[PDB]
């Protein structure tokens, strides 16, 4: 009864976060690595995770109530955003400045958030 | 104008052979990619006469078993020559490669995408080239 | 001097096609560029009569739709033979190279882009062959 | 009413203050990268933005009258200079000394600019 | 249809060839993974009649005999038509790439693994051409 | 089956060559490896009638003499039509490639070695085609 968020979930949801951010800043539009599909007509954006590293020892334990052990790590993502008409160099800054921006993050980045 | 070759041959046998066409749609809801959950949509047809023939050279790219890091992969490819009229993808649409399905050195049959079309829009006779490489195997390609 | 070929064929089809000359010109008052908004200007013409072909090999550059990062690009050239004059763009000038409406091989009609020009000064005939590469699509090429 | 001049006014007007002084001083013809012509004629410079780098964390906050924030991040923009013809060695240097002279800099940066 | 290229040849010789079948199979009892110890079964077979030739060139590659940091290796190559049908290996099976025995420029007899097979499937006469490598010396090939 | 090619020809001239086996031997009473002291045994024998000719092109690496930044070392090389069997070396054995002995660039005489060897199995006539290179100067070749 005790359940939680386990990876696949936080890493699948950190994508969507991205995309809706860089759709709602930039005004381009967004197209993932996963599959491949003809080239969009007019400017969009790509997004790629490109890398992911762990680190290595556990921080907390979560003991369910039956005795099962729950083990959380920190880990670190990166992407790789590619803009690919337009003015791209000016697209990509807004979608940097944004995070800067409190109103616009707590949309997608609530506080208490797994990223 | 040309008048021969704007007939059927009546010497070298031709053959027809199925084909299907291809396009693709988004099916997730709220993601807010264009890509979504793809899905692709079939509508079948065959060609009316074609000539099948494989690679003439012993190209290390054209083999049909290559030796990769994980194991023995499959390869295979034609040249075809046709009176029908089949496309490639084009882009800002929905429409992807036509495929037709042909026999491989495995001696089963499996998907051939169209990489390559040659048209002479000067000479008027509808007769075409096609250069096709087989899909890889446990997948609809791309 | 020549004689046969100082004059048309009358065996082989030929076909006219559509052109059109390109300037450019200088449009932000106040930026200190020979750039400035560019902009082309246009004034269309026709070719006597012509003949179009596709490229002959199967080069991984000269397929029509091509895999990148972003999606399945596309591509398309001929070789055109002509009676017409047409001229590539001159340095230090405001002339850009002629363009010329053709059909591609997703079914529609594209503007090609001469590159490559060939003459014969020392024979007399006004016999021309030329080198085509199709625009990239959603755009007016440069 | 609480108006300012956004990231896109800035950035398109530091190339042509650019382009002004390398005209005004070496004396050569200019060109951007943007869009290709036919290669001019005489010595002349070709301008391009080759670079930007972001500060991760803004410096000033402003609040507008009915309380929407506007936030301020500090960045540095490369350009690469690259005279053909004539002496374009020398031409750059005198691009370069331009920026210690007092009355020339203020026709084009002056006090208070965003660059 | 074709008619003559339909029956065997009456001028030039032609020679039968043995050939054996392969597969693999798992033995470890614990092991978990699917390569386990391999093993590898055969079944024997006869091609009706065949045409055996070497290289054509003289490419570094193709030399009999190649200097090594260890020593003088050993290699060898072929290439036969025949009209018996022989398969390459299948990728999601348990089956492998057939291989026949055939002379080599030791003086000896070695097994030669099929690595390229050409079909013409619009034509009908059962007529192949493979292209075959010499299995590495002190092993079975893979 | 073959006639014509099955006996000796009587138009082109044709001439014997010299040749002689090579085998390897390690001497060293104590030391623990396969080489050894290593030496060679030779035992020489002729070819029946072979025909030498040079090389075609003028590729760098088939001139005679070469620049290096030692002194201007030489090479040579040849392609040969013999009705005698001459072997390459094999692996996990004490035989080596055969050598026949043939004239130079220089005016002298010199050892060429057997590099590529070529047979037609399914044909039957003894009809052979070899491609050789002369032996390091001051050496016995390996």
Do not use: R, T
């Given at each position: 009864p005790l359940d939680f968020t386990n990876s696949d979930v936080v890493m699948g949801a950190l994508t969507k976060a991205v995309g809706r951010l860089c759709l709602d800043v930039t005004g381009y539009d967004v197209v993932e690595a996963d599959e491949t599909i003809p080239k969009p007509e007019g400017p969009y954006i790509l997004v790629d995770l490109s890398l992911l590293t762990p680190l290595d020892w556990a921080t907390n334990e979560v003991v369910d109530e039956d005795g099962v052990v729950h083990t959380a790590h920190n880990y670190t993502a990166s992407y790789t955003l590619t803009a690919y008409r337009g003015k791209p160099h000016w697209a990509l800054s807004r979608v940097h400045q944004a995070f800067g921006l409190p109103f616009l993050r707590e949309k997608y980045f609530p506080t208490g958030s797994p990223y | 104008a040309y008048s021969l070759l704007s007939s059927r041959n009546r010497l070298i046998p031709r053959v027809e052979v199925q084909c299907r066409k291809r396009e693709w749609v988004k099916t997730d809801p709220?993601?807010?990619?264009?890509?979504?959950?793809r899905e692709v949509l079939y509508t079948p047809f065959t060609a009316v006469e074609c000539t099948v023939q494989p690679m003439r050279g012993k190209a290390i790219r054209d083999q049909n078993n290559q030796l990769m890091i994980g194991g023995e992969e499959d390869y295979d490819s034609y040249t075809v020559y046709s009176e029908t009229l089949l496309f490639r993808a084009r882009e800002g649409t929905e429409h992807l490669s036509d495929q037709m399905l042909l026999p491989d050195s495995g001696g089963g049959q499996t998907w051939f995408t169209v990489m390559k079309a040659d048209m002479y829009?000067?000479?008027?006779?509808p007769r075409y080239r096609y250069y096709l490489i087989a899909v890889p195997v446990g997948t609809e390609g791309g």
């Open positions: - | 709220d993601s807010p990619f264009l890509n979504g959950g829009p000067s000479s008027g006779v």
